[PDB]
Design a protein around this ligand. Sequence first.
Ligand SMILES: Cc1cc(C)nc(SCC(=O)Nc2ncc(Cc3cccc(OCc4cn(Cc5ccccc5)nn4)c3)s2)n1
Ligand SMILES: Cc1cc(C)nc(SCC(=O)Nc2ncc(Cc3cccc(OCc4cn(Cc5ccccc5)nn4)c3)s2)n1
Ligand SMILES: [Zn+2]
Ligand SMILES: [Zn+2]
Lengths: 300, 300
Amino acid sequence: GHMERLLDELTLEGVARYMQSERCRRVICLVGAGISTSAGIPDFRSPSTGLYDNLEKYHLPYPEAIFEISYFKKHPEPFFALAKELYPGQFKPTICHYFMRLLKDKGLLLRCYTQNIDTLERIAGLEQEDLVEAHGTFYTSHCVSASCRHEYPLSWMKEKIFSEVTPKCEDCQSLVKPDIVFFGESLPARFFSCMQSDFLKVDLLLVMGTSLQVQPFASLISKAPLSTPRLLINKEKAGQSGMIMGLGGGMDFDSKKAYRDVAWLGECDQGCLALAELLGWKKELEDLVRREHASIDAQS
Amino acid sequence: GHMERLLDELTLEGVARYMQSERCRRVICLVGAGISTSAGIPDFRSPSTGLYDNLEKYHLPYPEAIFEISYFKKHPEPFFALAKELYPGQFKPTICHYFMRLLKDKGLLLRCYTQNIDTLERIAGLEQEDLVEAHGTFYTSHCVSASCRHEYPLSWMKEKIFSEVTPKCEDCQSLVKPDIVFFGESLPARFFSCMQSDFLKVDLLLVMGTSLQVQPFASLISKAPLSTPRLLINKEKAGQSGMIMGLGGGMDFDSKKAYRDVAWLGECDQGCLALAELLGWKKELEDLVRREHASIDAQS
Ligand SMILES: Cc1cc(C)nc(SCC(=O)Nc2ncc(Cc3cccc(OCc4cn(Cc5ccccc5)nn4)c3)s2)n1
Ligand SMILES: Cc1cc(C)nc(SCC(=O)Nc2ncc(Cc3cccc(OCc4cn(Cc5ccccc5)nn4)c3)s2)n1
Ligand SMILES: [Zn+2]
Ligand SMILES: [Zn+2]
């Protein structure tokens, strides 16, 4: 026999009918750089953006040094010069971000796991307890001295970045680092406690704008229950992997045993708008996006 | 420029010279089913063993149910019948197991992470603090009742398995389950605390007898520092993956930018014997294996 098939069809339409059923109570979103590209934030981890060409001016010992905590702590100037160069010109969350805001407000969002450091999930109205920032965030920064750990808001860090003043702690004069996770740093215990709890409870996994190549994200889709449907909204297929019954396995969109995974291929905004339309949420979403973007524009 | 290359050559000979240098102080072993196949324990997660054919007699609702905690707790009889059928006829650790014992005794072993549930690492002389059992172990079993959690040794569980008596707790009559991790169960917090600490400290990763397909193992090789050499001893290449500078990346044995990863293709015993020989440990290892196997044979 076969385990229950919660999707009636392996399509967006099937996912939408499942989302409207009684069974679909707790949704986890896994989101990456693809949900912020339409907001004008390039994927720094992509080869196509050409960050290798970006780094030559700083004269690093090797190009990977920009991501490493040991190098940062001794020579922070390249990081902060790069951060100025890459600082987004505006912070308008995308349709995809506001789709997650609707999930929150409808009580469907168990958690949003994000690979992004841009804070747009928070600007869109997701709160701290809704979020697991898998690579940290620019939202807060801390003094790197263990005895101090003075916390600084993004407004403080922004001024330092734009004025090209290396941020130093006002209490102890140590370096102040954004709460993004450099190579050589550990994730908080919260990441793993959330992850172990959340993935026992998930009724639907929405994977949006991520190739699922980079850890810790690349481990997450296999933690869902075996019958929990998984929808990918992304430009290309991702997360596909010889194991018994495809267990300990990635996505199976296309084999003859495929029973729960769906790939919708295109831009995340377009995918989320199509999904919202199926759910009867298109007007709510478009109205939400309009008023929120307007509120941001009203403060310029 | 390029980060330091701790291996002078991408060969076993290069790894051995590195192991003998001052820099190589802390070794992590990541081991899987391939280190116990020569001891007569097949890889149950492999398609080649044909566990699908093994399960038909038990009349499960679906074949994946044998691995799921919810099904076990309601219908434990298939699991225990299967466990009898798969119970190893002997427990002689392999040359590979005893290679890790040498690393322990020489003070080089930071940790052994194992995918195996067979207890052979413990029989070989690795202690609890040396080990992270990524899929748990048969070594201990527990009453499944949260209010009780009575612990039972393997000798107790073995008698129950062979006599075909479903193990019940002597205090409360709930089911007693081996400490192997079923689908729907969480890993201990120790796994993640060890993992975050260990992988900041690792000077050499020895990956032996694992395809690195199944989580949580599939996330571990990317947590090592970027300059830490990684040796694979396995029948075929594994852990190979478009990301900037191959970051957030699997093994790079074969590209033109390969700088730290080595694949030795063959049986784990043969690989470990060859590595030991390079290190001047062949006699020590062969003597260790002989006396330990003899000690086991002396108790038959
Ligand atoms: C509010 C605000 C301010 C600013 C300045 N930007 C942004 S969004 C735009 C952006 O790309 N900005 C960047 N500013 C510095 C960057 C370099 C860097 C250095 C160290 C760790 C780090 O991010 C955390 C990490 C590290 N890794 C590891 C790994 C894996 C695979 C490939 C590359 C890196 N992934 N995520 C990043 S990228 N948002
Ligand atoms: C001391 C002793 C006693 C006995 C009886 N055997 C052994 S070694 C031989 C052997 O294969 N025995 C087995 N006895 C029952 C088995 C079935 C089963 C049921 C549930 C979880 C579990 O192991 C833990 C897990 C679960 N997963 C998940 C996943 C991922 C990918 C493919 C298949 C399973 N990986 N490891 C395993 S396999 N050693
Ligand atoms: Zn301070
Ligand atoms: Zn009990």
